[PDB]
Amino acid sequence: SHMTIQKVHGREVLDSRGNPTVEVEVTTEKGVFRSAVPSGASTGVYEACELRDGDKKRYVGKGCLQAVKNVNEVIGPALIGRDELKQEELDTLMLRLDGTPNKGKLGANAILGCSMAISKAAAAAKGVPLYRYLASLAGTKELRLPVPCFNVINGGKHAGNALPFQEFMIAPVKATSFSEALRMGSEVYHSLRGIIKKKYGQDAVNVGDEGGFAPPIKDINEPLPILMEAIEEAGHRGKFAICMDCAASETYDEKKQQYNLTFKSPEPTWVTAEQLRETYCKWAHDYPIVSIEDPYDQDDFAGFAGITEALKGKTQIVGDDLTVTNTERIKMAIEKKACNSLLLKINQIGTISEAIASSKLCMENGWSVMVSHRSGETEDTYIADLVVALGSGQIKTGAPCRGERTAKLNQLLRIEEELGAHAKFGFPGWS
Amino acid sequence: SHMTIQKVHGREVLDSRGNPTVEVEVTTEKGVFRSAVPSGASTGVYEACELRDGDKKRYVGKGCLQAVKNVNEVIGPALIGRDELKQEELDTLMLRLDGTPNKGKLGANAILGCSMAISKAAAAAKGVPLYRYLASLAGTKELRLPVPCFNVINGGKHAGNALPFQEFMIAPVKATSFSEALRMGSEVYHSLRGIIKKKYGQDAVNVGDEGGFAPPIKDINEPLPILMEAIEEAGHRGKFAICMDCAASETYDEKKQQYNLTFKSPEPTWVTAEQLRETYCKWAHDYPIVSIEDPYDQDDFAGFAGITEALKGKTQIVGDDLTVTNTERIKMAIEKKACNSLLLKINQIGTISEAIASSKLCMENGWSVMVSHRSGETEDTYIADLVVALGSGQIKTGAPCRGERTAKLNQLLRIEEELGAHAKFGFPGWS
Ligand SMILES: [Zn+2]
Ligand SMILES: [Zn+2]
Ligand SMILES: [Zn+2]
Ligand SMILES: [Zn+2]
Numbered sequence A, B: 001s002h003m004t005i006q007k008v009h010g011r012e013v014l015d016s017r018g019n020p021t022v023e024v025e026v027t028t029e030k031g032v033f034r035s036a037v038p039s040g041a042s043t044g045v046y047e048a049c050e051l052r053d054g055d056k057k058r059y060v061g062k063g064c065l066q067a068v069k070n071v072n073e074v075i076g077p078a079l080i081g082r083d084e085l086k087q088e089e090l091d092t093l094m095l096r097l098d099g100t101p102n103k104g105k106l107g108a109n110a111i112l113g114c115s116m117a118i119s120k121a122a123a124a125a126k127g128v129p130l131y132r133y134l135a136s137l138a139g140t141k142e143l144r145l146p147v148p149c150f151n152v153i154n155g156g157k158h159a160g161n162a163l164p165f166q167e168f169m170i171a172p173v174k175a176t177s178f179s180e181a182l183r184m185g186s187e188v189y190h191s192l193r194g195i196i197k198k199k200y201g202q203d204a205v206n207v208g209d210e211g212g213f214a215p216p217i218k219d220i221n222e223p224l225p226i227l228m229e230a231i232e233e234a235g236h237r238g239k240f241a242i243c244m245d246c247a248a249s250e251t252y253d254e255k256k257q258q259y260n261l262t263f264k265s266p267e268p269t270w271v272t273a274e275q276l277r278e279t280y281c282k283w284a285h286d287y288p289i290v291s292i293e294d295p296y297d298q299d300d301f302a303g304f305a306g307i308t309e310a311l312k313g314k315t316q317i318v319g320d321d322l323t324v325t326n327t328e329r330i331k332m333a334i335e336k337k338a339c340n341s342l343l344l345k346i347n348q349i350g351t352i353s354e355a356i357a358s359s360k361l362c363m364e365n366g367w368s369v370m371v372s373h374r375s376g377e378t379e380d381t382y383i384a385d386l387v388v389a390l391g392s393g394q395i396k397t398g399a400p401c402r403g404e405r406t407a408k409l410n411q412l413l414r415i416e417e418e419l420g421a422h423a424k425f426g427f428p429g430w431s
Helices: A065-079 A087-098 A108-126 A130-137 A178-200 A223-233 A273-286 A301-310 A327-335 A352-364 A382-390 A403-419 B065-079 B087-098 B108-126 B130-137 B178-200 B223-233 B273-286 B301-310 B327-335 B352-364 B382-390 B403-419
Strands: A007-014 A020-028 A031-036 A150-154 A167-171 A241-245 A258-260 A289-293 A316-319 A341-344 A368-372 A394-396 B007-014 B020-028 B031-036 B150-154 B167-171 B241-245 B258-260 B289-293 B316-319 B341-344 B368-372 B394-396
Touching: A007 A065, A007 A108, A007 B403, A020 A065, A020 A108, A031 A108, A065 A087, A065 A108, A087 A108, A087 A352, A108 A130, A108 A352, A130 A352, A130 A382, A150 A178, A150 A223, A167 A223, A167 A289, A178 A223, A178 A403, A258 A273, A273 A289, A273 A301, A289 A341, A301 A316, A301 A327, A316 A327, A327 A352, A341 A352, A352 A368, A352 A382, A368 A382, A382 A394, A382 A403, A403 B007, A403 B403, B007 B065, B007 B108, B020 B065, B020 B108, B031 B108, B065 B087, B065 B108, B087 B108, B087 B352, B108 B130, B108 B352, B130 B352, B130 B382, B150 B178, B150 B223, B167 B223, B167 B289, B178 B223, B178 B403, B258 B273, B273 B289, B273 B301, B289 B341, B301 B316, B301 B327, B316 B327, B327 B352, B341 B352, B352 B368, B352 B382, B368 B382, B382 B394, B382 B403
Parallel strands: A241 A289, A289 A316, A316 A341, A341 A368, A368 A394, B241 B289, B289 B316, B316 B341, B341 B368, B368 B394
Antiparallel strands: A007 A020, A020 A031, A150 A167, A167 A241, B007 B020, B020 B031, B150 B167, B167 B241
């Protein structure tokens, strides 16, 4: 009877780039449950509304005071006295309280932290860790520790360099435990620093938004041999796969219908999609490239489809800006066989219930699901419990560097330890 | 009666550079209390022992399995059934269990996380937040939110550049609240990115270990005008002071008795201490330089003393590698008037009780105390509660960038909010 939501409180906190974001605390008799909202830099146009203040006098327009106010004065008062166990009911209340398709009234950033923190309070009421609670909500038959995909050379909007494509990842697919995966990842990362420093010098080993090295590289092919060399030097030959996120929307010009591979440089380098596919097929034959995210513009369903079929069985194609963790956009991707993997970003959609529905839809149609961070992260570790709960076997959450990335990896170590040596690890299709 | 320590468990986790460190959980009836140990790169020779495995097959010798084992098999079993409220008694037990001056048997890294987590479990038993509990332990008369000293241009061992000196900091000394201080810090940080990128180009805006920019700067004077320009452009002229950490030990050659200002470069640049003092006095007259940490080698008590007196009243001189948070080394610094400020690093000494004794000794003799992170940090936020509890008014915990830095700043926002608008902010001598 006294087992309901007692208090809801939002505040403005800083993310890992130093920009304001929203954090929410749900207080019950079982404690104070705290969830912070991440923020993207390379954001799809179809993402749910991230609500900013636009006051040029605070954080040059990036304050989240309005979203915080919406938590404190609108959403909070509606949740007091409510049964936190009713995830779908409460998520649906919050959708209706908003009343708009994109969460543009209240903000996906106001709503999401409430959604998240409600589920923490509920897990606690059930007497189970978050990952167990969410796996019941998602109807997951089998927990697993995922293979981490470590963005170790950073480009695009996440890094100070000419490099046009955003993410060059290494994934220890042949590890047999999360423990071993994390150590192998870290070990290759440390070898990679020496390789980059020798090749490009001292000034090349500083880090991007996601903890990856940001070398002075322009050419999109150039990182790949450096990744293989790092893998080998660490003692891990044969044990790794490569994952790519091109984030190609960031380079696309809609009026020219072409991709600028030097958009962060003075002169432009225009490239057709048919010249992009030549490059991708060449990646996939040359390297253990098991995943390619956003190989095309977020509305190029045809390019997406073409490359999903030409690489079927070798290389999964991941919708991120394409799908934006949204069942409507997913349904279009399914219909056109545009891709075969979902990048799941809770803040692309804005409720836990919706993000879970997105995962179930995609896995029912045979896709994989890679739970993801945003490039602007916090100390929050929700996505660690979330990927385990969904049983998907794939997470990208950064290089093994920078606390807003390592916090997630460490939370995965804790979950691992709780589940014991019988706990499943990895993505079966890559193992 | 059932109010004792129930379980103690250590594990290996990753720090913000991706290196292993120790984390400890103390379980009581009131919950699971978790504390992780930080790690330095520019470590004084007088620091308590950080115990590593030296197995070149795991993390090229950097594993903390032995320290974790010492927690799990030696320290843990001794704490079960003990009253967590007895901080000094338990800290002293752990010192005796070690039995060596430097904590070289068990490891300062094994001991410290136990110390920390015991105090969290105790705060919980007392029914008060950590900062309140620690302020009672320290006998603090007045809580305060500190002015943060944001290391925004990174050099030395924390960055990929020629820059020999380690830390160039900005401190919003004229803010009237922690909220405003953090926002001003972030705002100047964002202006600074544009200034560096325009001057040095795109490749210059990637970040060092502590979230500061790592531009291609060699000259130790060159960051200072760039800091002033950033302060001004953000709208904050007159509101900031500069804090320096030279970490000069890292450049010192004992055999030559000189400082190499190009030790990360092919050719050496040898400089006398009398040429270093010329530079410091010039800094202090030219800029609002309110703090200079480790201006000399960790054993140059004479250089330290000379510059403490020549800059008395303008610029505090901070012992870090000099003092290593150790009452023995502090007593020598007091005797020679070597410095007038302590950089307090809990893991330089290895118990909470000792770190507190160090703070009280220094403040009783009239010094300031700047609570500090290490360059290898975690998601742990202990030092946020610690600086508030000690009432010292000064913290350095990184640029407002990278989650292992922003986690501390955000925890300071939470404490601020708990204490209300009557809560004291800042270092009175700088306000
Ligand atoms: Zn993106
Ligand atoms: Zn993406
Ligand atoms: Zn140091
Ligand atoms: Zn220092």
